[PDB]
């Protein structure tokens, strides 16, 4: 079902794709997984533990 | 005990490990080089993986 | 919102007091970023006072960890609402949905 | 002797991103100049962001103003996102008042006749009473980069985060050009969104001028 | 005054010996330390007006894997003891130069026909160890000019991998240095080697000339 979503809009199946380093301009070798996720943030905060 | 104990950990390790490795059919395969400073100038102007 | 849910937010977010739920359906008589006025239904009312639900939102008050407690509306004026519906979003909600 | 490049082409394909073209370019130039060009054009240009903000009634961005269907923090946070073109100053104030139900887009900013609103469908608010107002200050000035509040920090002047940078989003290709009856060359195209408030080609321009006055350092012409 | 970036000055040149150096910019601009770095690195890895070797004739071994009487070591090490040799050339674009040489001992760079315009920065460098009297050598040896590395992969003659670039190896790290009152700004360190044929201030002048005439429809 993920992969015919995919395929539902126009990305890759394989779920990864191809990066370029952000500095060099130089293409990543080996496809790598990039996509969304549900990030938190935890009420551990460095002003209140410095 | 005496072993080290500042071996690298996990990403060190890893980078060492793929760029210490070897294809058996690779971009440019099988040329001569006069010393590792052409190799890395091969490696980093893309003529050689 | 989360893009990736289990569809159990909505019953987290509506069955904790941090939304503000419509008790009586009816249609939204006036929107403000601290009250909402909403004109009961005549199949929804008591034979007299004819009334209106009144929803006073909880601005910028203190939790028990410091943090801040807010509701925001996000219904519009002049629009329907059912009974079970949320008018004010509370902390970490979102259109209803729970959104950590 | 390299062949130098120029600007050939400039499609702009909407009023928000355009398609500048660069040729021709030489064996692994279109490379080194595209990510240069990248990274000074996403960087350092500059803007004209919104910062600092009155309203009439309000003490500070954490109250609530009558007859309005936003939190005072949430109008910030909408004009933090307005885009705008100052033409011959390094800063101004613009104006904004209104009355009566309804939305309160860009659009009903007092005129100031030497600026320019891009985008008037920009909702800031919504009125939702007959006999409400809002009456604003709302003060904008060019800047580069981005510089929070507080590190640039009366008791009704709310400063809001500036972002002063008119570009969202650089991509680029290079792309092989038959072009002057000789194959081994080279063309880039860089694609490029935008806010509204900068011509492609001046970006560009601005870019190059930025580069070519940092290499000054370890060259003499 | 949002024109006015940070203009740097080189902090100092670590002069070693006269291929290698060290320079260092600071303070630069935050991110302009990579984005300088790279282009240089580009510009002097794989565009170079240089002079290499690209082709070798040895007389007798018309084929790449064969062998010589009285030469301890077999031609792979001879084209790689070729691709050591730095050269100089003016104006002309190819030359044929030749070695011939018979007797015990080495031969190195300064045995080869010193007629024409041409030197060699290296005249000790050896060629190719001789170990009887009796066998000779003779080679012809062609010379030519390019804008970077072009391997004989991409191409009785001998191809040898052309090095026109004059650098061996070029290295940045961008450090973080401050000035008084500000966090974030970076410190460019430029290492680099080269064969002797322009000390490594040339190159990085050469490099920066050429980028700088390429931004010239823009400015």
């Given at each position: 079902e993920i992969k015919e979503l995919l395929k539902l809009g126009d990305l890759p199946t394989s779920g990864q794709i191809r990066l370029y380093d952000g500095r060099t301009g130089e293409q990543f070798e080996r496809p790598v997984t990039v996509g969304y996720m549900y990030m938190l943030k935890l009420n551990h905060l460095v002003d209140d533990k410095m | 005990?005496?072993?080290?104990?500042?071996?690298?950990?996990?990403?060190?390790?890893?980078?060492?490990?793929?760029?210490?490795?070897?294809?058996?059919?690779?971009?440019?395969?099988?040329?001569?080089?006069?010393?590792?400073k052409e190799a890395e100038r091969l490696y980093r102007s893309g003529l050689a993986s | 919102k989360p893009l990736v849910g289990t569809g159990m937010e909505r019953a987290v977010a509506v069955d904790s007091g941090?939304?503000?739920?419509?008790?009586?359906?009816?249609?939204?008589?006036?929107?403000?970023?601290?009250?909402?006025?909403?004109?009961?239904?005549?199949?929804?009312?008591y034979p007299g006072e004819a009334g209106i639900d009144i929803y006073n939102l909880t601005k910028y008050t203190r939790s028990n960890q410091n943090t801040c407690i807010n509701q925001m509306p996000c219904v519009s004026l002049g629009e329907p609402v059912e009974r079970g519906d949320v008018l004010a979003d509370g902390p970490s909600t979102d259109l209803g949905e729970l959104a950590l | 002797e390299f062949l130098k490049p120029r600007l050939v082409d400039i499609e702009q394909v909407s009023s928000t991103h355009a398609k500048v073209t660069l040729e021709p370019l030489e064996r692994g130039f279109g490379h080194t100049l595209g990510n240069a060009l990248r990274?000074?054009?996403?960087?350092?240009?500059?803007?004209?962001?919104?910062?600092?903000?009155?309203?009439?009634?309000?003490?500070?961005?954490?109250?609530?103003?009558?007859?309005?269907?936003?939190?005072?923090?949430?109008?910030?946070?909408?004009?933090?996102?307005?885009?705008?073109?100052?033409?011959?100053?390094?800063?101004?104030?613009?104006?904004?008042?209104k009355s009566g139900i309804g939305p309160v887009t860009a659009a009903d900013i007092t005129h100031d006749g030497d600026v320019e609103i891009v985008?008037?469908?920009?909702?800031?608010?919504?009125?939702?009473?007959?006999?409400?107002?809002?009456?604003?200050?709302?003060?904008?000035?060019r800047g580069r980069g981005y510089v929070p509040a507080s590190t640039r920090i009366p008791i009704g002047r709310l400063l809001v985060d500036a972002c002063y940078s008119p570009v969202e989003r650089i991509a680029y290709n290079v792309e092989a050009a038959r072009v002057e009856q000789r194959t081994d060359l080279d063309k880039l195209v860089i694609e490029?969104?935008?806010?509204?408030?900068?011509?492609?080609?001046?970006?560009?321009?601005?870019?190059?001028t930025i580069l070519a006055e940092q290499l000054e350092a370890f060259v003499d012409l």
């Amino acid at each position: 079902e993920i992969k015919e979503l995919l395929k539902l809009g126009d990305l890759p199946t394989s779920g990864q794709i191809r990066l370029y380093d952000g500095r060099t301009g130089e293409q990543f070798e080996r496809p790598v997984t990039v996509g969304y996720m549900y990030m938190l943030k935890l009420n551990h905060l460095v002003d209140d533990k410095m | 005990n005496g072993e080290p104990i500042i071996v690298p950990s996990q990403d060190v390790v890893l980078g060492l490990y793929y760029m210490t490795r070897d294809c058996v059919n690779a971009k440019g395969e099988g040329m001569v080089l006069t010393g590792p400073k052409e190799a890395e100038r091969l490696y980093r102007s893309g003529l050689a993986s | 919102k989360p893009l990736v849910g289990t569809g159990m937010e909505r019953a987290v977010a509506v069955d904790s007091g941090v939304t503000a739920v419509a008790k009586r359906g009816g249609v939204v008589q006036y929107v403000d970023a601290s009250r909402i006025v909403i004109k009961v239904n005549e199949d929804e009312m008591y034979p007299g006072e004819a009334g209106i639900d009144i929803y006073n939102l909880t601005k910028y008050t203190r939790s028990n960890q410091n943090t801040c407690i807010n509701q925001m509306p996000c219904v519009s004026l002049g629009e329907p609402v059912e009974r079970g519906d949320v008018l004010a979003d509370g902390p970490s909600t979102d259109l209803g949905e729970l959104a950590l | 002797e390299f062949l130098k490049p120029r600007l050939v082409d400039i499609e702009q394909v909407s009023s928000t991103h355009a398609k500048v073209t660069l040729e021709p370019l030489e064996r692994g130039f279109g490379h080194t100049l595209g990510n240069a060009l990248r990274r000074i054009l996403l960087s350092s240009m500059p803007g004209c962001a919104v910062t600092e903000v009155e309203i009439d009634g309000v003490l500070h961005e954490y109250s609530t103003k009558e007859g309005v269907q936003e939190d005072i923090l949430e109008i910030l946070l909408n004009l933090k996102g307005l885009a705008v073109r100052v033409q011959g100053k390094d800063e101004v104030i613009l104006t904004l008042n209104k009355s009566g139900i309804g939305p309160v887009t860009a659009a009903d900013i007092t005129h100031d006749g030497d600026v320019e609103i891009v985008k008037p469908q920009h909702v800031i608010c919504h009125l939702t009473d007959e006999n409400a107002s809002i009456s604003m200050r709302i003060k904008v000035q060019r800047g580069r980069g981005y510089v929070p509040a507080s590190t640039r920090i009366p008791i009704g002047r709310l400063l809001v985060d500036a972002c002063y940078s008119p570009v969202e989003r650089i991509a680029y290709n290079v792309e092989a050009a038959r072009v002057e009856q000789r194959t081994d060359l080279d063309k880039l195209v860089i694609e490029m969104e935008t806010n509204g408030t900068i011509d492609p080609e001046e970006a560009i321009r601005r870019a190059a001028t930025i580069l070519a006055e940092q290499l000054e350092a370890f060259v003499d012409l």
